[PDB]
Amino acid sequence: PDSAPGQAAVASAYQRFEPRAYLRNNYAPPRGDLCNPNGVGPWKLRCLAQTFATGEVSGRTLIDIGSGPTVYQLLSACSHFEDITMTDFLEVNRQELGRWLQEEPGAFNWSMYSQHACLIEGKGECWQDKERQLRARVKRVLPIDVHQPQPLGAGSPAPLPADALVSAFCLEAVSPDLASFQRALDHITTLLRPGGHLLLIGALEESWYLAGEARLTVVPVSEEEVREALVRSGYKVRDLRTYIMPAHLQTGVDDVKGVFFAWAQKVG
Amino acid sequence: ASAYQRFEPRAYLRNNYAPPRGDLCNPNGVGPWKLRCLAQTFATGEVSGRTLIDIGSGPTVYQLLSACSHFEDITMTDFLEVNRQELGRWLQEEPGAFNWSMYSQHACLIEGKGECWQDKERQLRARVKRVLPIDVHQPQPLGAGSPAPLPADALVSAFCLEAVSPDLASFQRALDHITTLLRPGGHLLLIGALEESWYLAGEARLTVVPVSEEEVREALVRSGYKVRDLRTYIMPAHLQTGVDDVKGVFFAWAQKV
Ligand SMILES: Nc1ncnc2c1ncn2[C@@H]1O[C@H](CSCC[C@H](N)C(=O)O)[C@@H](O)[C@H]1O
Numbered sequence A: 001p002d003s004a005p006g007q008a009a010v011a012s013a014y015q016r017f018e019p020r021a022y023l024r025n026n027y028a029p030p031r032g033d034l035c036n037p038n039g040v041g042p043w044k045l046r047c048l049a050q051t052f053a054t055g056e057v058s059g060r061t062l063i064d065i066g067s068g069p070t071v072y073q074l075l076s077a078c079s080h081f082e083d084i085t086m087t088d089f090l091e092v093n094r095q096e097l098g099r100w101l102q103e104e105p106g107a108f109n110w111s112m113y114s115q116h117a118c119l120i121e122g123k124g125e126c127w128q129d130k131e132r133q134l135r136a137r138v139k140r141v142l143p144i145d146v147h148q149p150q151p152l153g154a155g156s157p158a159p160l161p162a163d164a165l166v167s168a169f170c171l172e173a174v175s176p177d178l179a180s181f182q183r184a185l186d187h188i189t190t191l192l193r194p195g196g197h198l199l200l201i202g203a204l205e206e207s208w209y210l211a212g213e214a215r216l217t218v219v220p221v222s223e224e225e226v227r228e229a230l231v232r233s234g235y236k237v238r239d240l241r242t243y244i245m246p247a248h249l250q251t252g253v254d255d256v257k258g259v260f261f262a263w264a265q266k267v268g
Numbered sequence B: 001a002s003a004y005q006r007f008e009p010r011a012y013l014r015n016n017y018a019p020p021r022g023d024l025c026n027p028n029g030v031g032p033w034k035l036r037c038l039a040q041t042f043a044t045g046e047v048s049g050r051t052l053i054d055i056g057s058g059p060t061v062y063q064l065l066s067a068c069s070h071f072e073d074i075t076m077t078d079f080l081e082v083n084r085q086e087l088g089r090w091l092q093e094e095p096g097a098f099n100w101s102m103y104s105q106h107a108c109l110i111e112g113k114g115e116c117w118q119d120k121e122r123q124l125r126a127r128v129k130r131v132l133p134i135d136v137h138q139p140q141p142l143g144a145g146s147p148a149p150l151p152a153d154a155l156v157s158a159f160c161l162e163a164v165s166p167d168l169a170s171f172q173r174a175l176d177h178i179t180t181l182l183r184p185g186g187h188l189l190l191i192g193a194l195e196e197s198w199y200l201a202g203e204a205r206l207t208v209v210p211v212s213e214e215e216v217r218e219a220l221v222r223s224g225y226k227v228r229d230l231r232t233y234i235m236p237a238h239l240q241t242g243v244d245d246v247k248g249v250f251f252a253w254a255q256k257v
């Protein structure tokens, strides 16, 4: 039938999305604890650092899809791309990012994440330098809607097509069903050049998460469903790993069972 | 040397461990060079045991960051009470403690074990059992009935001896004194100023004995050490700040025979 109904429920639910609560829920401890090497934060950072460390993912332009109020997903990326586009559906998230870009004190503090990224990249970089570079290389923060065939709109500011895409915890968190998820992946895929790379991180078998007042409906996906959608979109899957959420990190902020990381390269 | 009675801890930490000398971002600065010497030395695995004493800690902890994972019992020392108080403020996470986090981070970075800086800090705090008075001019620097386990398996001392000695001879004697504290076959990590004659600490102006790398070498030998490593950092111009006239910094790894 049609996609409007579910898409409309999603947009409606996000009107209540609270950036600070979401940051607290997922990026403050225990989930944001970077000392525990078995924690989810360290694993996410590690997937990104190792992928970029192959030297196989480079270019001039990078687009981060559904950045929300977070930047950790770009810490290892930023040394490999000189032009970075960050994006989100919600103005309030885009402002949160604005706060970090201006280095305001009222901003969320990512320095543990910056430090940790420096630590595992193994180049002796201080975190203030990593941050300075991320801030310099973010060239724009744009509204985005992945349900649109042109997710950035027509006549986008963004350099297109990009050399690479990053997207963490977006697609499954905004798609009422798997077919919607697939279409979203198809949409963002039009922004990536052939032979370009997508780094996709996401929730496994999740149906809801909390962001303050907002309780959001997530399509629960399996690793295998993630693989097939990537193939369906015209990628070769180069890496797909799974982290199983330990019980102690199951805090009632969501019903997440695990997290996936895909490295995929667009065929062409 | 009652000049040390006017010595202000915060002023000293300010002059030496805040920007520019305390910026650790640039790999060519003195802070990173110092941490590197300590890290690489312990990474060899040849310096180890159970107990370690830090001679003339002042109000600083950076010199034990790499050390702390190799020794379960650590003694810190200084001549000034005010310094011992400043140490205590950091060990006990009290208010207005100096912020060493940048240094903990850099040690974690250099060590390359994937360790978070908070774990590093917690372990150092855990292994420092006591902060004791000391005078290297005394034949028994720690006094007679010290709480400190002796003889130590290892010593560390940074910027103390030359900074408390009017001349080479006094420097040599003080080296003799601290050396009695070290078990035979033990290790000493000595860091110090090269060709320095004064530095400032608030109202205090201290006299320093200017020493050369050769003179440091010979002093260690004279004290019965085998010198396993002696390295020099030349002080770049941008780190010549008005707080002293230091020319360079030396790092020595020495073993008692
Ligand atoms: N239709 C849509 N198209 C693109 N992004 C959307 C969207 N609807 C909601 N979003 C955004 O999807 C995000 C999911 S939270 C993920 C945030 C971040 N990437 C991280 O790694 O933590 C929210 O920021 C939300 O505003």
Ligand SMILES: Nc1ncnc2c1ncn2[C@@H]1O[C@H](CSCC[C@H](N)C(=O)O)[C@@H](O)[C@H]1O
Residues within 6 Å of the ligand: B004, B007, B055, B056, B057, B058, B059, B060, B063, B078, B079, B080, B083, B134, B135, B136, B137, B158, B159, B160, B163, B164
């Ligand atoms: N007679 C003495 N015996 C032992 N230490 C002394 C001393 N007189 C002064 N000191 C201490 O020697 C220190 C020199 S500054 C100490 C340097 C510090 N450990 C660092 O690495 O930065 C001061 O803390 C001072 O209080």
Ligand SMILES: Oc1cccc(O)c1
Residues within 6 Å of the ligand: A026, A169, A173, A203, A206, A209, A254, A256
């Ligand atoms: O970072 C996130 C976002 C949404 C669900 C989740 O389990 C984790």
Ligand SMILES: Oc1cccc(O)c1
Residues within 6 Å of the ligand: B016, B159, B163, B193, B196, B199, B244, B246
């Ligand atoms: O850390 C120090 C201590 C004393 C003199 C100096 O130049 C540096």
